[PDB]
Design a protein around this ligand. Structure first.
Ligand SMILES: NC(=O)CN(CC(=O)O)CC(=O)O
Ligand SMILES: NC(=O)CN(CC(=O)O)CC(=O)O
Ligand SMILES: NC(=O)CN(CC(=O)O)CC(=O)O
Length: 492
């Protein structure tokens, strides 16, 4: 039948927590209430002394993304298994279209790669790495027909993905017309390009040059710039992988000023820092290289977690894009050749619980909001996911917040052979993971097959995102002053 009763636990949604059992049938939660009856044949999962939470939604992944022909080692199959083992039940991955290439072709290639491999549900964001009439039409098709309401634009990567301010204005205006949210990689690509050339010329070829060539002012600048453009066109904006206190403070100030913008720190920037780039062991230092870089101010992850607790920042992903030690070593002599990307998909939930809830910065309900609910609201499938409620999808984690686990590359399920959180002791253990109403992870073992997950098709004009946008189109139009024509003389 696929019938499950989760009994004895405490349900934790983003608004409040309460003791209740949860009845799962046919992929769905069909009842939430105290002391529910066990129908003959249903499996009982005993959640006594545990929390029963919506499974995590990782807003930010890059499973098996190609770097110069060699692919990230966590692929859609191993990467989603690792997600489940860490309490995350959905991933949103970026379709990376090359400059001049069809976005629809790249979307089809992502679906054909991911559909037969994912072990949990997923969806896609689509990168807009160039601009033309064709891109414009393909974005409308993606939004209206292909289930994608999120487009990602780059202010970094000069010559490769970067768009200039005039093209960002056009692309953002078009996001707004099709009801999508505009995501941005906010670092100044002209400064990165110059900074890297400068560090190499000085013989700083190691990972410390990767951070030194683009310190946090470069990320803060472009973040304010994207906000200013999106505000000029009334387009909702999403700043992916916020890595620094000063970029987080730009998003914080803009939201207090009423800008429709959301900021997304990732597990890496919440759980570790960039002092690792200065480690004497080259291999250790290269493990942390990603764009934008982790920051060498050690107060950074605690401050980003304070701003996530306070809703200056709103939700979390991992930017999981993993490369083995032998793949990182492509840039042993030149940091610009190190394939960028770190791990996180598996450890996100425990890292945030340990650094955010156990530390007393946020409570269990805000934890659910920043790890599933807000993702579901922004990308338009709430309360289908991100809530324990009748009629929601049965993507459910039984969570032990009292026991600790030590995070280690020796025990993790990711394909990558190191872990940037190596050694960390976290309160908060996913003990059972249910995905699409099936037990896919329990007693430390995965039970799931490649292709069991499904692509989630979303509609455009997410209400959480657009209700203010649409009201501002109605009352915020600029008005002419009514005047008599100017009568006087004009110079020759
Ligand atoms: N890493 C950096 O900071 C500079 N590089 C980034 C890298 O590719 O590791 C940018 C460039 O190629 O100009
Ligand atoms: N050295 C790199 O990984 C260059 N990367 C930079 C990044 O991933 O941020 C661009 C790409 O992968 O196409
Ligand atoms: N860690 C990285 O920089 C990987 N890359 C991967 C890509 O987006 O091409 C960019 C990002 O993750 O920010």
């Amino acid at each position: 039948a696929g019938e499950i009763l989760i009994k004895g636990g405490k349900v934790v949604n983003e608004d409040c927590s309460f003791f209740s059992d949860v009845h799962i049938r046919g992929g769905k939660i069909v009842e939430v209430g105290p002391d529910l009856r066990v129908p003959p044949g249903a499996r009982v999962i005993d959640a006594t002394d545990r929390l029963v939470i919506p499974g995590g939604i990782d807003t930010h992944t890059h499973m098996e993304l190609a770097f110069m022909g060699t692919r990230a080692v966590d692929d859609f199959h191993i990467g989603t298994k690792a997600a489940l083992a860490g309490g995350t039940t959905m991933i949103l991955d970026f379709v990376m279209t090359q400059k001049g290439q069809s976005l629809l072709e790249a979307y089809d290639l992502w679906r054909k790669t991911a559909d037969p491999k994912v072990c949990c549900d997923y969806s896609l964001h689509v990168a807009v790495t160039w601009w033309s009439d064709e891109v414009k039409d393909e974005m409308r098709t993606l939004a209206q027909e292909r289930g994608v309401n999120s487009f990602k634009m780059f202010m970094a990567y000069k010559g490769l993905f970067m768009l200039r301010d005039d093209e960002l204005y056009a692309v953002f205006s078009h996001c707004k017309e099709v009801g999508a949210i505009a995501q941005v990689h906010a670092e100044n690509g002209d400064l990165i390009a110059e900074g890297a050339k400068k560090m190499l010329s000085l013989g700083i070829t190691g990972p410390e040059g990767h951070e030194l060539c683009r310190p946090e002012a470069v990320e803060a600048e472009a973040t304010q710039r994207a906000i200013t453009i999106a505000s000029a066109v009334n387009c909702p904006l999403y700043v992916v992988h916020v890595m620094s206190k000063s970029a987080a403070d730009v998003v914080s100030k803009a939201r207090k000023d009423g800008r429709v913008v959301f900021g997304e720190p990732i597990a890496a920037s919440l759980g570790t820092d960039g002092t690792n780039y200065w480690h004497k062991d080259w291999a250790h230092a290269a493990q942390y290289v990603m764009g934008p870089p982790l920051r060498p101010d050690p107060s950074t992850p605690g401050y980003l977690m304070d701003l996530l607790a306070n809703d200056d920042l709103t939700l979390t992903g991992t930017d999981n894009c993993t490369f083995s030690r032998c793949q990182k070593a492509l840039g042993k002599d030149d940091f610009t050749r190190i394939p960028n990307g770190v791990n996180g998909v598996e450890d996100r939930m425990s890292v945030i619980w340990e650094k955010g809830v156990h530390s007393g910065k946020m409570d269990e309900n805000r934890f659910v909001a920043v790890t599933s609910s807000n993702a579901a609201k922004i990308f338009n499938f709430y309360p289908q996911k991100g809530r324990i409620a009748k009629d929601s999808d049965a993507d459910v984690v039984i969570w032990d917040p009292k026991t600790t686990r030590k995070i280690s590359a020796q025990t993790h399920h990711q394909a990558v052979d190191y872990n940037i959180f190596e050694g960390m002791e976290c309160h908060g253990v996913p003990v059972v993971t249910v995905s699409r109403g099936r037990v896919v992870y329990e007693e430390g073992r995965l039970k799931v097959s490649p292709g069991q997950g499904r692509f989630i098709h979303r509609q455009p004009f997410s209400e959480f995102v657009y209700k203010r946008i649409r009201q501002r189109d109605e009352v915020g139009k600029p008005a002419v002053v009514i005047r008599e024509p100017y009568a006087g003389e004009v110079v020759a």
